[PDB]
C-alpha cells in the first residue's frame, strides 16, 4: 500500500523504524511529498516552527508554545547538539494535544543503514525521538549538506500553501529560530530572508547569533566576530571570509525579517512575545491584508501580545467604526482572552446590541 | 489522631474482609495452606524546581 507509493514516488531503500523514516530523492517535487504526507502521513497544522542549527529555558518555553498551538517543529535531528535535548524534552512533554517532531537528516550521514521494520540500536547517528525522519541523499556517501536546499524548498512551498485556520491572511507563519553559529545556518538564513520567512534569534550564547545581535562594510564585519569566532576566522581562508562578509551583508539588508531578543531581559513568556512581534512586523510588511485592520487584529489577538496590539490598532484615533469588533470581540469571548476584552469595553460597544438574541443563543 | 487512623486501615487491610465466624475458618484454612509514573514524577519535580 504505502510502500508501493513510496517506491513509485522516487521512480527504494525505505523502511519504517519503530516513527516513520523515509528516504527522498533530491530531484523531487516537495509539494507532492508534502501533499501526500498531509493526506496520509499526518494531520494539518496552522503554524510550523523552523529550527536552524538560560538557553534551555527559552527552548523549553518555545516547545511549550508549539505544543499549545499544535505547531510542527522542524529540526535537524542530529544526536550531537541541542537536537537531542529537544527530542528528550518533547518526549517528556508527550509523556504527560499531540506533539509531532520532524527531523531533516540526510541518509548519507548515518553509518548504520538497513533496508519490514528494521531495528537500529546504538557514524553521524541521530535521535529517535522525532516522529518523522526524512533523509535526502545525493546518491553517494560523500557527506554533503544538500538536504538544506530541499528543506528550504519545502518551507517555501508550505508558506505558499494557504491555510484557512489561524488567520494571518490565510497563510502560515514559518517562524525561524537559530542559536548555533554554523556556516550552513548562515546560508539558510540568507536564503530565508531572501524569501518572506521571518527569523528571530536570541542573544544567548552563539558563535554568530551574538555577532548578529550586536550588529542590530568589510571593516565593520572584520571588527565583528573578531572575539566571537576566533577559531572560525583562523580556519576560514580569505575566500571564506569574503563569503562570510557577503552573506552577512545580504542578511542585514532586511530588518523586518530579522528579530533580535536580548538575553538580559527576565520577563516571563518573552519567548512567545518576541515571536509575536516578529510575525506582526512581517504581516505589516506584507501590505496585502495590512489594509484590513480587523485582519491584523485577528492575528495579533490569537497570540499573547496585547500591550503592543493596543498601540498598533486599538490606539487608532483615525476613525473607529461604531460596530468595531462585531465578530472579533465575539471570538475573543469564545477564545476566552483575559485582560483583552477589557480594551474592547474601554473603547466600548453596545453590550445589549452586541449580545443579540441569536448570538446569545449560539453562545 | 490522623496518624492513628492509618494504623487501623493497615490492620484491616492486612486481614482484608472476612466475618468473624468465617474469619476463624479462613485463618485455619490459610494456616493449612501456609516506569511511566516515574517519568511523570520527574516532570513534576522539574516543575516544582
Reference A72, options A39, A106, A38; nearest CA is A38
Spatial distance between the Cα atoms of A232 and A205, rounded to a whole number of angstroms: 16
Q: Phi and psi of A150, rounded to 5°?
A: -65, -40
Residues of chain B by 3-state class (helix, strand, coil), percent to 5: 80, 0, 20
- Experimental technique: cryo-EM
DSSP reduced 3-state for A231: helix
Chain B: give the shortest CA distance to residue A93, in Å.
8
DSSP reduced 3-state for A97: coil
* Cα-based distances in Å from A62 to A50, A155, A280, B48: 11, 19, 18, 19
HEC readout, B12-26: HHHCCCCCHHHHHHH
Residues of chain A by 3-state class (helix, strand, coil), percent to 5: 45, 10, 40
Stretch (H or E) spanning A176: strand A175-178
Spatial distance between the Cα atoms of A148 and A133, rounded to a whole number of angstroms: 14
List, in order, residues 6 or more apart from A321 with CB less than 8 Å away.
none
Contacts of A56 in chain B (CB under 8 A): none
For residue A242 the three cell numbers come to 569574503
Phi-psi region of A37 (alpha: psi -120 to 50; beta: other; left: phi over 0): alpha
For residue A54 the three cell numbers come to 538560560
Four-CA torsion A189, A190, A193, A199, nearest 10 degrees: 20
List the single residue in B with minimal CA-CA distance to A91. Answer: B39
Spatial distance between the Cα atoms of A30 and A179, rounded to a whole number of angstroms: 26
Would you call B19 exposed, middle or buried from its count of C-beta atoms within 10 A (0-12, 13-18, 19+)?
A: exposed
For residue A334 the three cell numbers come to 469564545
Q: Do A96 and B40 touch (CB under 8 A)?
A: yes
> How many Å separate Cα B6 from the centre of its chain?
10
Spatial distance between the Cα atoms of A300 and A296, rounded to a whole number of angstroms: 6
Sheet holding A199-202, edge to edge: A20-25, A132-137, A101-104, A72-75, A48-52, A175-178, A199-202, A258-261
B5-44 residues touching A, CB cutoff 8 A: 36, 39-40, 42-43
Instruction: Classify residue A170 by its DSSP letter.
Output: T
Amino acid at each position: 500500500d504505502l510502500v508501493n507509493f513510496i517506491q513509485a514516488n522516487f521512480k527504494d531503500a525505505f523502511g519504517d523504524i519503530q516513527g516513520k523514516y523515509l528516504r527522498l530523492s533530491c530531484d523531487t517535487d516537495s509539494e507532492t511529498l508534502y501533499e501526500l504526507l498531509t493526506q496520509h502521513w499526518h494531520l494539518k497544522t496552522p503554524n510550523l516552527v523552523i529550527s536552524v542549527t538560560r538557553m534551555r529555558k527559552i527552548f523549553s518555553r518555545l516547545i511549550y508554545i508549539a505544543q499549545s498551538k499544535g505547531a510542527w517543529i522542524l529540526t535537524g535531528g542530529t544526536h550531537y547538539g541541542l537536537m537531542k535535548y529537544i527530542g528528550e524534552v518533547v518526549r517528556d512533554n508527550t509523556i504527560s494535544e499531540n506533539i509531532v517532531a520532524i527531523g531533516i537528516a540526510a541518509w548519507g550521514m548515518v553509518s548504520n543503514r538497513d533496508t519490514f521494520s528494521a531495528q537500529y540500536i546504538m557514524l553521524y547517528i541521530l535521535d529517535n525521538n522525532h516522529t518523522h525522519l526524512l533523509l535526502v541523499d545525493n546518491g553517494c556517501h560523500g557527506h554533503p549538506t544538500v538536504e538544506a536546499k530541499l528543506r528550504n524548498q519545502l518551507e517555501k512551498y508550505i508558506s505558499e500553501r494557504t491555510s484557512q485556520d489561524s488567520n494571518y491572511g490565510g497563510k502560515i507563519p514559518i517562524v525561524c529560530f537559530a542559536q548555533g553559529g554554523g556556516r550552513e545556518t548562515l546560508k539558510a538564513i540568507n536564503t530565508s530572508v531572501k524569501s518572506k520567512i521571518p527569523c528571530v534569534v536570541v542573544e544567548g550564547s552563539g558563535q554568530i547569533a551574538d555577532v548578529i545581535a550586536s550588529l542590530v562594510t568589510s571593516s565593520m564585519v572584520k571588527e565583528k566576530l573578531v572575539r566571537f569566532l576566533p577559531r572560525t576566522v583562523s580556519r576560514l581562508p580569505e575566500e571564506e571570509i569574503e563569503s562570510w562578509i557577503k552573506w552577512l551583508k545580504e542578511i542585514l539588508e532586511s530588518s523586518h525579517l530579522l528579530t533580535v531578543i536580548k538575553m538580559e531581559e527576565a520577563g516571563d513568556e518573552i519567548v512567545s512575545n518576541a515571536i509575536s512581534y516578529a510575525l506582526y512586523k512581517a504581516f505589516s510588511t506584507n501590505e496585502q491584508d495590512k489594509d484590513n485592520w480587523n485582519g491584523q487584529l485577528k492575528l495579533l489577538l490569537e497570540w499573547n501580545q496585547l500591550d503592543l496590539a493596543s498601540d498598533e490598532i486599538f490606539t487608532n484615533d483615525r476613525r473607529w467604526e461604531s460596530a468595531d469588533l462585531q465578530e472579533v470581540m465575539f471570538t475573543a469571548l469564545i477564545k476566552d482572552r483575559p485582560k483583552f476584552v477589557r480594551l474592547f469595553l474601554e473603547n466600548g460597544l453596545n453590550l445589549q446590541k452586541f449580545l443579540t438574541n441569536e448570538v446569545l443563543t449560539e453562545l | 489522631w490522623k496518624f492513628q487512623r492509618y494504623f487501623l486501615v493497615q490492620e484491616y487491610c492486612n486481614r482484608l474482609n472476612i466475618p468473624f465466624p468465617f474469619v476463624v475458618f479462613a485463618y485455619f484454612y490459610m494456616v493449612v495452606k501456609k516506569n511511566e509514573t516515574l517519568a511523570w514524577e520527574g516532570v513534576m519535580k522539574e516543575n516544582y524546581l
